[PDB]
């Protein structure tokens, strides 16, 4: 076939019941996570390409960049719950990546308040139970993989995005293969 199992994708031996249709798991210390967002816009190709009531989920994984590792996940259940993702996610890469000035939590915090977040409501949402459960559920939803690696993309709990098995000659044409697979699978 054009699309087969061990080559865009591979198949979960263990499905994972009532998971989020497209799920995709990043790290801001993942070097490929940095190219997926600022070079290749992957979550935003794949958008383009999904059907018709498809909604797309993003977690932060606490199994790199140890201490600092788990504060990012945090981070990122603060910026879910303030609905602040497209405003901190490139800082906090360049951050931790690029510039290398994220080193602890108020180095994370400091990114928040530059992009307009005000004090008061970072720390209220940093210390909330609604963020500590937002931070269980990105737990959980790893756990439930068994994930080791990012970058990450799972479709409807059961199918996960091989991207070692497409060309990277252009980055274009990746991006789009990969997109395609997930409509691909998204279908199935």
């Known amino acids: 076939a054009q699309y087969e199992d ?3 994708y591979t198949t979960l031996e ?3 019941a ?4 497209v799920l995709e798991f990043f790290s801001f210390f993942c070097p490929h996570c940095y190219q997926f967002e600022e070079v290749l816009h992957i979550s935003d ?4 390409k999904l059907p018709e009531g498809v909604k797309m989920t993003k977690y932060h994984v606490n199994f790199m960049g140890g201490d600092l590792g788990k504060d990012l996940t945090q981070a990122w259940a603060v910026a879910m719950a303030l609905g602040v993702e497209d405003k901190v996610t490139v800082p906090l890469f360049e951050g931790v990546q690029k510039t290398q000035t994220i080193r602890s939590a ?8 530059n992009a307009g977040i005000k004090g008061e409501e970072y720390d209220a949402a940093w210390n909330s139970f609604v963020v500590k459960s937002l ?3 990105q737990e959980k939803a790893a756990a439930d993989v068994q994930l080791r690696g990012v970058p990450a993309m799972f479709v409807n709990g ?3 995005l091989n991207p070692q098995g497409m060309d990277t000659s252009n980055m274009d044409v990746f991006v789009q293969q990969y ?3 997930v409509k691909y699978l998204s279908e199935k």
């Open 106 to 113: 108020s180095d994370i915090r400091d990114v928040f308040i």
């Open 6 to 8: 061990g080559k865009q």
């Open 179 to 181: 997109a395609d697979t």
């Open 135 to 137: 931070v269980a559920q």
């Open 14 to 16: 263990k499905p994972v």
């Open 45 to 48: 190709n794949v958008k383009k």
């Open 158 to 160: 059961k199918y996960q």
């Open 18 to 21: 009532g998971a989020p249709q």
